[PDB]
Amino acid sequence: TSGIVPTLQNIVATVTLGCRLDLKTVALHARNAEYNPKRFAAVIMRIREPKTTALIFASGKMVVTGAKSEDDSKLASRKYARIIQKIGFAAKFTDFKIQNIVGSCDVKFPIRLEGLAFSHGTFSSYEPELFPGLIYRMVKPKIVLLIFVSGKIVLTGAKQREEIYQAFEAIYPVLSEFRKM
DNA sequence: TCTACGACCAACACAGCGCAGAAGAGCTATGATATTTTTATGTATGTACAACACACATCGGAGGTGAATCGAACGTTCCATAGCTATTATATACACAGCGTGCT
């Protein structure tokens, strides 16, 4: 067991609004709406109360990023869809699928990263020239982990909570064995 | 008037003519020779042919080269496809570039 549970910091989800959207009008009429078709083929909006960000496409496909919890992402998608209703489009809410749940935690001890890369070499790839963190790719569940010398752990690539939590619980014994000073 | 010159006589002897023999002038006949006739005999001529050997223009094969003609490599363009590029949120942490400031 571990005395600390990871805390989430970003949830990436998608919603199908089910209607063709004219990105020209939603940029002009919505308040915080940025449309640069040369730079990107979507309109970026963000609203203050969930601190999220919606990438809205012409086909009606939607991306919600920046949420802390699944209910927060659901509420953010609800309010962005309500904005699209108030702007003059028939954007029926159809589905809501959360793809990414990245959460960070701290084991509060220094880690010997080279020894961990040497021991669990089939799942790890340490290249401190490029990035100062170790990339651990767990096979079950499919969660990737960024491991650092300060003990900070970044778990990325979860669909719901019961992957990142058990990923941390499985990665804790193989990091408790590596301690510096 | 008369003196040169011619008649006249004798002797004779040497020229002159009869006679016979020679001889040769001129005609006549016959053989040899050169001249013309005839023919005949070989030669020349226009034009054609053929046989044969050599030489030469003409046709044809061997070789060389410009003009013409072939492939082959390559650049370019298009159809379709797939793979990539770009954003955003977020924790984490380190390395480098760039800019505001200030005080040495």
Side-chain angles (χ1 to χ4, degrees):
Chain A
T1 175
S2 308
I4 181 172
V5 65
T7 176
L8 320 183
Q9 63 266 9
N10 182 20
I11 297 194
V12 181
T14 188
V15 170
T16 299
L17 296 181
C19 64
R20 166 63 39 98
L21 286 167
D22 186 74
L23 300 191
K24 171 69 156 51
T25 57
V26 72
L28 290 177
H29 292 345
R31 278 168 195 162
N32 322 306
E34 323 306 306
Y35 188 33
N36 195 358
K38 167 169 300 181
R39 186 176 182 269
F40 190 45
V43 60
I44 318 294
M45 293 183 286
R46 50 180 71 91
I47 53 171
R48 286 182 170 89
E49 62 77 10
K51 210 185 175 57
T52 62
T53 289
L55 299 88
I56 318 291
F57 291 84
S59 69
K61 296 292 186 177
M62 171 146 167
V63 176
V64 187
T65 66
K68 297 296 181 295
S69 48
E70 308 98 322
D71 291 331
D72 186 74
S73 55
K74 199 59 174 302
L75 186 62
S77 57
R78 278 281 184 275
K79 278 199 171 295
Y80 287 127
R82 200 254 189 170
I83 289 172
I84 305 300
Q85 262 74 70
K86 296 302 178 170
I87 211 162
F89 285 93
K92 45 178 75 68
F93 189 88
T94 53
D95 50 12
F96 174 82
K97 185 157 61 68
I98 43 179
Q99 295 85 0
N100 225 318
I101 298 182
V102 56
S104 62
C105 57
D106 181 23
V107 307
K108 292 174 297 180
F109 54 85
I111 313 178
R112 297 192 294 106
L113 277 296
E114 293 83 3
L116 180 53
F118 167 65
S119 57
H120 295 73
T122 177
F123 310 123
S124 56
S125 58
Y126 189 36
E127 294 294 328
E129 294 293 328
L130 308 187
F131 185 71
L134 169 62
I135 301 140
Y136 198 101
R137 290 193 159 85
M138 293 177 70
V139 55
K140 196 245 189 178
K142 283 288 303 307
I143 312 298
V144 68
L145 293 95
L146 306 183
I147 302 299
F148 298 91
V149 297
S150 58
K152 302 286 185 53
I153 315 299
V154 176
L155 301 96
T156 301
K159 301 290 182 175
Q160 69 275 16
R161 312 281 271 262
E162 293 83 3
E163 301 146 80
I164 174 170
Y165 288 167
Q166 65 182 357
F168 177 72
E169 294 294 328
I171 208 68
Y172 197 80
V174 305
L175 271 66
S176 60
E177 184 178 1
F178 295 100
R179 182 260 320 156
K180 188 176 303 303
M181 191 65 277

